[PDB]
Structure 1
């Protein structure tokens, strides 16, 4: 299965005897599931996203069958609004990002050029939008608000912005705000021909 990114990359997963839909998320280090019944021991953990932090129950060595491929690893359970499969499990199912091929044992970071400036950014199949840390951009913007796993942040929305992502040019909407990492989301990933393969 090669997966393009014009829509959210959702898969069916089977975990703890239950069927769920989950988001293949190259932008997430961890795997976080909405509140669900999981058996066994767990440890309290705290995880941050765009917007702040949530408390989660951490379960180790959990079997999960992702789109018909089995993996065992750590699953976090908490107040996430989308089930997300993060890199700790994506690597186990041989997931790659293609546009160069990119494995997922490390964060898929790329160099971008935008508004004359060079930045590092995360290729994030779990993000609908592109969000960049505070930076000087030219032109008008529109007040906007985006939600992450931790809640919401205020961003400035800039439309039809030119970005060169790993030497491929795209034009699209970029959001600017208090994100801790520069995020290249699906609105731009599609333009550089990014696919998810496993």
Structure 2
């Protein structure tokens, strides 16, 4: 689809067998989700945003379905203000910016 930006580009995602809403975020290198239970092993990591740095749980090679498009990649879980889909998965679903 072609998504205009007069509203927040929010979409439904499926991860760990659960539906969630997430923001397509071209300014994010990485995908960061709010606190949730995810299966598999994880490593502690730090990530920085506009206001500072936070501790996150890094899950590798996780399936997320983004508006029916499959991606398998790294998902960070921690105290982000919003579920964000970052470029690491946006590229997997073939997302581009156009103007």
Instruction: Please give the secondary structure, in 2, of the residue aligned with 1:150.
Output: coil
User: Does residue 162 of the first structure (1) align with residue 63 of the second (2)?
Assistant: yes
**RMSD over equivalenced CA pairs, Å:** 0.4
The offset of 1:171, in angstroms, is 0.2
| C-alpha distance in structure 1 between counterparts of 2:24 and 2:64, whole Å | 13
Structure number with greater CO (CA < 8 Å, separation at least 6) is 2
Q: TM-score, normalised by structure 1?
A: 0.50
Q: Deviations over 1:139-182 (max 9, x none)?
A: 11000000000001100000000000001000000000011100
Query: Bigger radius of gyration, 1 or 2?
Result: 1
Q: Deviations over 1:49-76 (max 9, x none)?
A: xxxxxxxxxxxxxxxxxxxxxxxxxxxx
User: Is there any run of 5+ residues in structure 2 with no aligned partner, and where?
Assistant: none
> Runs of 4+ in structure 1 displaced over 4 angstroms?
none
| C-alpha distance in structure 2 between counterparts of 1:139 and 1:162, whole Å | 12
| C-alpha distance in structure 2 between counterparts of 1:165 and 1:182, whole Å | 12
Q: TM-score, normalised by structure 2?
A: 0.99
User: Is there any run of 5+ residues in structure 1 with no aligned partner, and where?
Assistant: 1-99
The total of aligned residue pairs comes to: 99
| C-alpha distance in structure 2 between counterparts of 1:125 and 1:180, whole Å | 16
